[PDB]
Design a protein around this motif. Sequence first.
Motif, PDB file in Angstrom:
ATOM      1  N   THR A  25      -4.650   9.470 -39.449  1.00 44.70           N
ATOM      2  CA  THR A  25      -4.883   9.828 -38.053  1.00 44.70           C
ATOM      3  C   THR A  25      -6.344   9.736 -37.591  1.00 44.70           C
ATOM      4  O   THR A  25      -6.604   9.890 -36.406  1.00 44.70           O
ATOM      5  N   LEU A  57     -16.980  10.183 -17.282  1.00 45.01           N
ATOM      6  CA  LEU A  57     -15.692  10.871 -17.390  1.00 45.01           C
ATOM      7  C   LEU A  57     -14.502  10.012 -17.875  1.00 45.01           C
ATOM      8  O   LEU A  57     -13.797  10.432 -18.800  1.00 45.01           O
ATOM      9  N   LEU A  63     -11.361   8.929 -24.553  1.00 46.02           N
ATOM     10  CA  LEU A  63     -11.735   9.337 -25.904  1.00 46.02           C
ATOM     11  C   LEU A  63     -11.045  10.635 -26.327  1.00 46.02           C
ATOM     12  O   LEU A  63     -10.454  10.713 -27.414  1.00 46.02           O
ATOM     13  N   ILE A  98      -8.646  21.084 -28.071  1.00 44.35           N
ATOM     14  CA  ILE A  98     -10.109  21.015 -27.891  1.00 44.35           C
ATOM     15  C   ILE A  98     -10.911  21.507 -29.120  1.00 44.35           C
ATOM     16  O   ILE A  98     -11.948  20.928 -29.435  1.00 44.35           O
ATOM     17  N   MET A 102     -13.399  19.201 -31.443  1.00 45.13           N
ATOM     18  CA  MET A 102     -14.740  19.628 -31.817  1.00 45.13           C
ATOM     19  C   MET A 102     -14.914  19.646 -33.351  1.00 45.13           C
ATOM     20  O   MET A 102     -15.936  19.192 -33.868  1.00 45.13           O
ATOM     21  N   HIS A 227     -15.343  25.641 -22.516  1.00 41.81           N
ATOM     22  CA  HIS A 227     -14.822  24.346 -22.114  1.00 41.81           C
ATOM     23  C   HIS A 227     -13.795  24.503 -20.999  1.00 41.81           C
ATOM     24  O   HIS A 227     -13.850  23.823 -19.982  1.00 41.81           O
TER      25      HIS A 227
HETATM   26  C1  TFY Z   1     -13.454  13.196 -30.048  1.00 42.62           C
HETATM   27  C2  TFY Z   1     -14.129  12.710 -31.084  1.00 42.62           C
HETATM   28  C3  TFY Z   1     -15.544  12.298 -31.000  1.00 42.62           C
HETATM   29  C4  TFY Z   1     -16.543  12.983 -30.402  1.00 42.62           C
HETATM   30  C5  TFY Z   1     -16.447  14.274 -29.719  1.00 42.62           C
HETATM   31  C6  TFY Z   1     -17.315  14.605 -28.745  1.00 42.62           C
HETATM   32  C7  TFY Z   1     -18.405  13.642 -28.305  1.00 42.62           C
HETATM   33  C8  TFY Z   1     -18.470  13.542 -26.773  1.00 42.62           C
HETATM   34  C9  TFY Z   1     -18.262  14.875 -26.025  1.00 42.62           C
HETATM   35  C10 TFY Z   1     -17.060  15.681 -26.525  1.00 42.62           C
HETATM   36  C11 TFY Z   1     -15.738  14.948 -26.239  1.00 42.62           C
HETATM   37  C12 TFY Z   1     -16.979  17.135 -26.055  1.00 42.62           C
HETATM   38  C13 TFY Z   1     -16.681  17.372 -24.558  1.00 42.62           C
HETATM   39  C14 TFY Z   1     -17.530  18.554 -24.081  1.00 42.62           C
HETATM   40  C15 TFY Z   1     -15.211  17.529 -24.120  1.00 42.62           C
HETATM   41  C16 TFY Z   1     -15.040  17.069 -22.660  1.00 42.62           C
HETATM   42  C17 TFY Z   1     -13.595  16.723 -22.299  1.00 42.62           C
HETATM   43  C18 TFY Z   1     -13.251  16.774 -20.810  1.00 42.62           C
HETATM   44  C19 TFY Z   1     -14.112  15.791 -20.025  1.00 42.62           C
HETATM   45  C20 TFY Z   1     -11.780  16.439 -20.593  1.00 42.62           C
HETATM   46  O1  TFY Z   1     -13.479  18.105 -20.311  1.00 42.62           O
HETATM   47  C21 TFY Z   1     -16.105  17.862 -27.100  1.00 42.62           C
HETATM   48  C22 TFY Z   1     -16.225  17.016 -28.384  1.00 42.62           C
HETATM   49  C23 TFY Z   1     -17.250  15.927 -28.014  1.00 42.62           C
HETATM   50  C24 TFY Z   1     -15.928  10.975 -31.646  1.00 42.62           C
HETATM   51  C25 TFY Z   1     -15.194  10.751 -32.975  1.00 42.62           C
HETATM   52  O2  TFY Z   1     -15.722  11.616 -33.984  1.00 42.62           O
HETATM   53  C26 TFY Z   1     -13.697  11.007 -32.830  1.00 42.62           C
HETATM   54  C27 TFY Z   1     -13.181   9.918 -31.893  1.00 42.62           C
HETATM   55  C28 TFY Z   1     -11.682   9.668 -31.965  1.00 42.62           C
HETATM   56  N1  TFY Z   1     -11.231   9.096 -33.239  1.00 42.62           N
HETATM   57  C29 TFY Z   1     -11.748   8.208 -34.097  1.00 42.62           C
HETATM   58  N2  TFY Z   1     -10.864   8.071 -35.121  1.00 42.62           N
HETATM   59  N3  TFY Z   1      -9.745   8.904 -34.876  1.00 42.62           N
HETATM   60  N4  TFY Z   1      -9.982   9.573 -33.668  1.00 42.62           N
HETATM   61  C30 TFY Z   1     -13.461  12.475 -32.411  1.00 42.62           C
HETATM   62  O3  TFY Z   1     -12.073  12.836 -32.391  1.00 42.62           O
END
Ligand code: TFY
Length: 253
Positions: A25, A57, A63, A98, A102, A227
């Motif tokens: 996954t 966004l 993502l 969420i 994280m 969040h």
């Molecule tokens: C989501 C993921 C990654 C990064 C997480 C981040 C970086 C950008 C910023 C993120 C998404 C935060 C945000 C504050 C959440 C915002 C979501 C919204 C806009 C809907 O409110 C929470 C976690 C943060 C990158 C990577 O590690 C992963 C990408 C997906 N992946 C790859 N292989 N299998 N799944 C991880 O799951």
Amino acid sequence: DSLRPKLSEEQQRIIAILLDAHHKTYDPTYSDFCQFRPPVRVNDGSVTLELSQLSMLPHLADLVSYSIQKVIGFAKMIPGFRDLTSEDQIVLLKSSAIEVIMLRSNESFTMDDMSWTCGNQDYKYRVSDVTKAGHSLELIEPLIKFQVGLKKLNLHEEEHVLLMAICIVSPDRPGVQDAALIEAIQDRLSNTLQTYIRCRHPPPGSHLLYAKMIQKLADLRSLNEEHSKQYRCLSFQPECSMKLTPLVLEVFG
Ligand SMILES: C=C1/C(=C\C=C2/CCC[C@]3(C)[C@@H]([C@H](C)CCCC(C)(C)O)CC[C@@H]23)C[C@@H](O)[C@H](CCn2cnnn2)[C@@H]1O
């Protein structure tokens, strides 16, 4: 006195199962990304402009959405998870999605520049890109703190997958029906974690690692409420829902 019971054959199967679920996954090569709506990074060194453009966004929304699908996959292969009423499966997923995201993102998070790097450049993510998706420091700074915190625990992947499993199967979530059952699955998982740490972790003077891991699950509930507070505020931005996905909408709305 400091007893170190050997891993049961069940405890081993659980790890194997979770280790494997994660391999199935989570893609460490990030080859699916070109499929996401493209990242747009506009210029500013402004809450108003951020909300006006919401340039990052659709990329981050894709993502996260993509990741939720991956987490859902992950949960299905958690031993015990299918034994729950699909209603307690939805609840547990929606309220941990969420947090698991994280948790799991730590694989891409690097202490070299305090970024998540899934790239190349184009898929590097820092404080500013997250602001550009309409979030404020009150979530983004503490998330970074938590990322560093987690990187420094130096978890074996075994601990990484158990931690995520444990987080998903939390009996104390708003709306759960059979907390008794869910608490049983969790206990099985923690017993596996607690035991795994004791047998297989160097040094150890610090099995203290288990307390520190449980502490991370607390930090997560915070970031979760924050969040969700901030998600609410994006929802108020007109035309915003089109920048999201049907899945991100249901999970957070
Ligand atoms: C989501 C993921 C990654 C990064 C997480 C981040 C970086 C950008 C910023 C993120 C998404 C935060 C945000 C504050 C959440 C915002 C979501 C919204 C806009 C809907 O409110 C929470 C976690 C943060 C990158 C990577 O590690 C992963 C990408 C997906 N992946 C790859 N292989 N299998 N799944 C991880 O799951």
